[PDB]
Design an enzyme around this catalytic site. Structure first.
Site, mmCIF file in Angstrom:
data_model
loop_
_atom_site.group_PDB
_atom_site.id
_atom_site.type_symbol
_atom_site.label_atom_id
_atom_site.label_comp_id
_atom_site.label_asym_id
_atom_site.label_seq_id
_atom_site.Cartn_x
_atom_site.Cartn_y
_atom_site.Cartn_z
ATOM 1 N N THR A 1 1.112 4.560 1.900
ATOM 2 C CA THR A 1 0.725 5.402 3.019
ATOM 3 C C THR A 1 0.895 6.844 2.572
ATOM 4 O O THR A 1 1.992 7.403 2.657
ATOM 5 C CB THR A 1 1.572 5.111 4.255
ATOM 6 N N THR B 1 5.668 -0.368 0.110
ATOM 7 C CA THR B 1 6.493 -1.385 0.736
ATOM 8 C C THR B 1 6.321 -2.720 0.030
ATOM 9 O O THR B 1 5.211 -3.097 -0.358
ATOM 10 C CB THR B 1 6.153 -1.503 2.217
ATOM 11 N N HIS C 1 6.252 5.900 -0.923
ATOM 12 C CA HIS C 1 6.825 4.597 -1.199
ATOM 13 C C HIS C 1 5.785 3.520 -0.970
ATOM 14 O O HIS C 1 4.909 3.647 -0.113
ATOM 15 C CB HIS C 1 8.058 4.342 -0.330
ATOM 16 N N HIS D 1 0.844 -1.178 0.000
ATOM 17 C CA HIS D 1 0.000 0.000 0.000
ATOM 18 C C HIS D 1 0.882 1.231 0.000
ATOM 19 O O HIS D 1 2.044 1.188 0.405
ATOM 20 C CB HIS D 1 -0.929 0.025 1.209
#
Ligand SMILES: Nc1nc2c(ncn2[C@@H]2O[C@H](COP(=O)(O)O)[C@@H](O)[C@H]2O)c(=O)[nH]1
Ligand SMILES: Nc1nc2c(ncn2[C@@H]2O[C@H](COP(=O)(O)O)[C@@H](O)[C@H]2O)c(=O)[nH]1
Lengths: 828, 828
Positions: A713, A792, A790, A711
């Protein structure tokens, strides 16, 4: 910078020495910006529109139309000052030495013997104000004239105590053909000429501080101005002086009697203006030749009435060839009286002829008292030798220079200099004034008390900044004051030296950030030329006597992209980026390293931060014309462009780091000066240990990953549990600017140990808007870290894998509670 | 300066190197004055009284009794600090290197391996505070001890990041035998020791600003002081730090675990003092050897209760050999708890042994929370490795140095660091704190807000003057504030540089005249030693880090000739007058030339003016110990000596002239600073064109004269015609001090052209008094000229004729109207 705009179908690039070319139709404002960050000094702008020239001329950049090549283009090479509303070019070219002349703008010097004293073959001519009699030589699309004159050489020589003139001018003519054109000094007499007559009408009043004989003539048609300067010398202060005897001293080959006769009158008038805001009749006696009159009438029109046996060519009424002796009640009151009743010795015995000089002096005073005995608003200026006399204490002495010192000085009087004030002065107490004290300035009016006022439009151009003035009083005069035009010097040096000078005098030095004004511009010289209707062809230097200008309370504070704008901001950076020994990405690498995005400097082509300010901070010496502070306050509150609050701090933090390695303690201060002013006009809050976060899920990630749910964030926030209902407004109101933004991924990287991630791109602008939208609704959002978006992938340590730029799109958005089992909003 | 007072009948002058001799019984304080203006550094004072030593010791001049020659005199050669109320000598002699030792004053270093690491043959010993264990070596008329220790070498080495010790000490031992003894640095620990314990009782509450580890131990028995310094480092500010990994770094050959174990406790206490003005019980676990305890007990007495398997030699109760594990409710509240529960790896595998270190850390925190869960006023200081942990934000981290960096840092907690404040910290965010951030100071309390207070006795010794503090706020803290002891740096340089430094940091520089205090001393270092009961043997240097001291609101403002007095005023002048390339009358000639008595410099032996101040102005760099400003205000209003107002202006005017030729812009400012302060505390009025005058007629003038009535015009005045009746009071009240003063004439001179006169002598002192009695009765008297008394003889130009000093006496005195035909008073 000197933008020269050339005809579309008639325009040539040749083997010239400092020529770039520019040509585009992308935008009027954006084109001028791209120009104004060009390096060289002379720019050809081949196809143009008037508004791109308007913006530059408003930015202080001289930008002009060129219609022809033979002489309209070759002679507009040289440097100049341009009035972009009347289309007049004031050239500043000293190439007129080639036809072997100097040139003045005062008619009286032409009637001297000076051409006996010039170098063999030279002359002087073309005597007009600002060279306004030059324009007969050129036939252009614009009015033009060369305002370069050699007043320096002649006037300094008079104040130089040197006697050989050929030696003098040969020295100074060689100084100009050696050293740098002082363009800023030359452009001021242009500036002063149009600066006051409009200012006087607009505010209905004006006070000026520290006028010098640069402005002997500027103000002669302005009674309603009140000038302040160094006080006069008084009879009251002869009691100091040691006794001394006749000193026969010759300091001028050529007779300059006309110069003092001009100055003593002019002093007498500004005095009369000081007392009464009106302008007088000007009687005279003993002064016939008076070729300095025509100089006066070029500025202000006065009635001159003269009594002298000899020819007065220039006057209204030369009443008689008798010299005004005792018919004194026949004078009008609103007046000044200039007495120069004198004689010339023949071959008579100096010891006996001296008796004659003494008796005239007694008489010339009787004329002065009988004058000032009857009417009001009457001033005198009387001739005296040095002898024991009974003088008023409060009166003012004048010894403007002359041909040679042979024991005479002049005294001026006011109505209250007679009302029961008299002292006895000895002989040698006057010679001691004559021989050592040269009067410097016709402006002998009292000093300016440094305090604020609300009726006053205060001008102060080159008077303050002196070390003897209380720094805080001038600071508060600038901060706590509307209605002004103040100038102060910039701290143009490194290691933050507060006082800077010439080893003669030191002057107080400032940064822009010394001042919490309310509605004011703080710009350079060239910027204020634009504000008042001017533009200049030469740029300012990073060091030298640069000066902040400060316009308080003016109509132009809100007009940001017009005046004192982001023009010129990146001119020096582009030199550094590409040419002067560095890689083009040097600024794009440094600021990410200094803001802890040092793992990644790949995506520093685009989506970097800290644009305008980082350049405003480290190269302030070049681009202080851009008032950084005015730029920020008007984006705190929308009164085009928008950046987030967060970006400005990172601009400041990186300039500190930059100035640390360099050890430029002045940027280092200036960075501290700004960042806590950024935290002043608006606060910044940080959800350092947050509770909620905004998450974005995607259809499919084209990478390998071991996290069960990858996802983005998108951002974190710390809020109360019943401000969820007004957070969800923002997600709802911008749901498609998130669905509609070009999310792309192209590679993997290491964000940190045991955190292997992808990179997301093209999202930040929405992220910066979102921070602003939440902000004014008083919602915390973002951490003190730099948010590098970013996705992950895995908690390992792996290798950066590159793929083609693959577009990713949004499954959903969601607002999640950190370590919670439920959400409450998700757009789709 | 080091005055050594020798026995009357037992006293020797030998072929010594810096010895003057002095011996007289004129007057006690006049003798000390004449001494204090002596040049050399070592003075033998052969027959003496105690009060002449009192005055000097009160003046900061070390002055001591010598009763014997063999060792009481030869060893008191070297420089020292003297407590003239308990008669203790603190020597500062580094000649103890000769018997091949260094010496410390901390017991813990003796139990290290350091003697393996000293140069071959050296040792360390004699470990007492201030060298208070030295006094067993000497048997004198006074108590004595050598307080010179080498704490610098050891402590700097710990903060030096260098690893070879023999190379280190050999470097620094050579620095002292090369460079100047820094006495202003060694005498402070003496000063600090007696400065606070008396100050705390007198003011009832003391605050100190910027304490450093100079004072780790000064304050341990002073809870009721509140110290302020640079704030702490918080867990809150780890979010900045880049991630980093284990860094095995060794920076100390010898183990210094005892040093951090000492510092972490001491930090923990000053924290506890900051919160609760209190002083605690001090529990400990894991820390047996604890040879740093005895250091603590030399200052303040604390109860130490320890749990450790091994030997604690120095404690009250070593409760158990079990280490405090969970029996935690058995602790008292008013406490601090220092946890150092640890282990030592053997040869076990570092990768598996690391698991043990992690579990202790979890436990050591559980002990910390259970401690701070129950009672109030509890402070912890706990051991941690670098791993991911859940820490309170507001807590304070400590990494005082150690033997070698191997991943541990300590954390201290307060009662409110538990109340719902917790954050997660990653692993490498701690290593980044460990490896780069060395804690500098146990004083981690919040900064001092720079503003005045009325309950506060503020000390500020070497904390302010830093460039980052707002200059005006400290100025107003000094001016608008009573109850303090502030120090600031003097502008010891020329060209008036406001900020001065070391090319590392700059500091704000002052003159004495920046401050309009109300009742305060502004003196030097040596002057304030006298005020507080000390005296020092070395004088201050004209350049170097000299500092103004400022005592506000103290009992000693009126006691002028005692403390911060005219002692030392002429020391440098006498060097210039006689020795350093000038005539003895150089100062006696210059000041008359610069005040327009340039015709006459014959009578500059006596009856000259401008005594104290002219020396205070041009040599302020030497004698700023004399607060010039305090001297003047207390003579404006009589609260011995008296000079006229007029003399002080001429002292100022001549220093300007002096500083102009020299181009010392700092005196030039300081002269301007004073003269308008002279015109502040009292006005001066001038009858420049007077109406009346005081005249003195004589029986017979032993000269030739053509004026019909020669007279002394003793003074002129401008008054109203009905203040004659209170002028005549003074004509009457001092009629015999005019009849009784030694009027003498000895020669003729030229006062000016056509004014041939005599000289009168011996009258001025009465003239200066008369000025004061007319003054306070608000009567104008005197002109801005210098009154040189003269008897007029003839209006010619003649030759100076000399006669024997012939006394003249008074026919009469008279008050005459200028160009009037009558008088109204004449004494006889
Ligand atoms: N966000 C933002 N970017 C700007 C602004 N002005 C210039 N830039 C960016 O900075 C670049 C400057 O180009 P340069 O002058 O370095 O060749 C522009 O091409 C644009 O990408 C601005 O006002 N806001
Ligand atoms: N009027 C006055 N004269 C002083 C004062 N102190 C010293 N002097 C004079 O200045 C002289 C200084 O001597 P020196 O120190 O230059 O050898 C003294 O001998 C005395 O004549 C003072 O306080 N007031």
């Amino acid at each position: 910078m000197k933008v020269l705009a050339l005809r579309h179908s008639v325009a040539q690039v040749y083997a010239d020495t400092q020529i770039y070319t520019h040509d585009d139709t992308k935008d009027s404002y954006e084109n001028a910006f791209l120009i104004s960050n060009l390096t060289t000094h002379n720019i050809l702008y081949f196809n143009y529109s008037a508004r791109t020239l308007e913006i530059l001329n408003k930015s202080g950049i001289a930008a002009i139309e060129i219609q022809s090549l033979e002489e309209l283009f070759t002679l507009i090479r040289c440097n100049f000052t341009y009035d972009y509303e009347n289309n007049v070019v004031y050239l500043h070219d000293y190439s007129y030495y080639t036809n072997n002349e100097i040139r003045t703008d005062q008619h009286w010097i032409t009637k001297t013997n000076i051409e006996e004293y010039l170098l063999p073959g030279w002359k002087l001519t073309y005597v007009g104000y600002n060279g306004n009699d030059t324009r007969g030589h050129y036939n252009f699309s614009f009015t033009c004239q060369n305002a370069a004159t050699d007043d320096d050489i002649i006037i300094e020589y008079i104040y130089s105590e040197a006697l050989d003139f050929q030696n003098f001018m040969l020295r100074k003519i060689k100084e100009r053909m050696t050293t740098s054109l002082p363009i800023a000094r030359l452009s001021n007499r242009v500036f002063r000429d149009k600066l006051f007559p409009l200012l006087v009408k607009k505010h209905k009043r004006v006070v000026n501080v520290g006028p010098r004989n640069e402005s002997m003539f500027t103000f002669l048609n302005f009674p309603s101005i009140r000038q302040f300067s160094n006080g006069p010398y008084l009879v009251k202060n002869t009691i100091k002086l040691k006794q001394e005897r006749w000193l026969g001293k010759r300091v001028s080959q050529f007779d300059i009697g006309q110069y003092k006769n001009m100055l003593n009158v002019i002093t007498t008038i500004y005095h009369y203006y000081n007392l009464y805001q009106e302008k007088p009749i000007i009687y005279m006696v003993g002064s016939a030749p008076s070729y300095w009159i025509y100089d006066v009438r070029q500025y202000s029109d006065f009635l001159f009435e003269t009594w002298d046996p000899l020819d007065t060519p220039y006057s209204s009424i030369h009443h008689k060839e008798l010299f005004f002796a005792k018919d004194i009640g026949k004078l009008k009151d609103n007046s000044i009286l200039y007495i120069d009743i004198r004689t010339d010795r023949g071959n008579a015995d100096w010891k006996e002829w001296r008796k004659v000089v003494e008796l005239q002096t007694i008489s010339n005073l009787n004329l002065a008292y009988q004058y000032l005995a009857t009417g009001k608003s009457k001033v005198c200026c009387v001739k005296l030798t040095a002898m024991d006399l009974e003088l008023p204490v409060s009166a003012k002495l004048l010894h403007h220079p002359t041909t040679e010192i042979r024991s005479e000085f002049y005294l001026l009087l006011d109505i209250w200099d007679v009302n029961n004030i008299k002292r006895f002065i000895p002989k040698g107490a006057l010679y001691s004034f004559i021989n050592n004290v040269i009067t410097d300035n016709v402006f002998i009016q009292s000093p300016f008390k440094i305090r604020t006022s609300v009726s006053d439009y205060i001008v102060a151009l080159y008077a303050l900044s002196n070390d003897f003035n209380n720094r805080e009083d001038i600071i508060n005069l600038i901060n706590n004051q509307k209605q002004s035009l103040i100038t102060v010097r910039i701290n143009n040096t490194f290691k933050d030296e507060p006082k800077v000078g010439f080893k003669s005098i030191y002057d107080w030095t400032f940064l822009p950030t010394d001042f919490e004004t309310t509605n004011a511009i703080v710009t350079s010289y060239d910027g204020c030329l634009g504000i008042f209707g001017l533009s200049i062809s030469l740029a300012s230097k990073p060091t030298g006597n640069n000066h902040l200008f400060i316009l308080n309370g003016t109509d132009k504070y809100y007009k940001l992209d017009q005046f004192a704008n982001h023009t010129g901001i990146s001119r020096r950076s582009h030199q550094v980026r590409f040419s002067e020994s560095a890689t083009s990405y040097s600024g794009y690498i440094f600021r990410d390293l200094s803001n802890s995005n040092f793992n990644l400097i790949g995506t520093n082509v685009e989506n970097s931060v800290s644009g305008h300010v980082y350049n405003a901070l480290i190269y302030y010496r070049y681009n202080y014309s851009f008032d950084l502070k005015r730029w920020i306050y008007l984006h705190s509150v929308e009164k085009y462009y928008e950046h987030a609050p967060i970006e400005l701090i990172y601009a400041c933090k990186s300039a500190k780091e930059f100035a640390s390695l360099q050890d430029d303690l002045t940027v280092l201060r200036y960075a501290n000066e700004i960042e806590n002013y950024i935290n002043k006009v608006y606060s910044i809050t940080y959800a350092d240990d947050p509770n909620y976060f905004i998450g974005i899920k995607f259809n499919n990630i084209p990478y390998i990953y071991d996290v069960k749910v990858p996802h983005l964030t998108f951002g974190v926030l710390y809020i109360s549990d019943n401000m969820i209902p007004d957070v969800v407004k923002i997600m709802k109101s911008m749901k498609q600017e998130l669905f509609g933004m070009d999310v792309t991924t192209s590679y993997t990287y290491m964000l940190s140990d045991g955190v292997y991630v992808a990179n997301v791109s093209g999202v930040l602008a929405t992220y910066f808007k979102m921070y602003n939208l939440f902000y004014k609704n008083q919602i915390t959002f973002g951490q003190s870290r730099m948010f590098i978006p970013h996705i992950t992938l895995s908690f390992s340590n792996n290798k950066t894998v590159r793929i083609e730029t693959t577009k990713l799109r949004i499954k959903s958005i969601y607002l999640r509670k950190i370590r919670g089992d439920t959400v409450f909003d998700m757009p789709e």
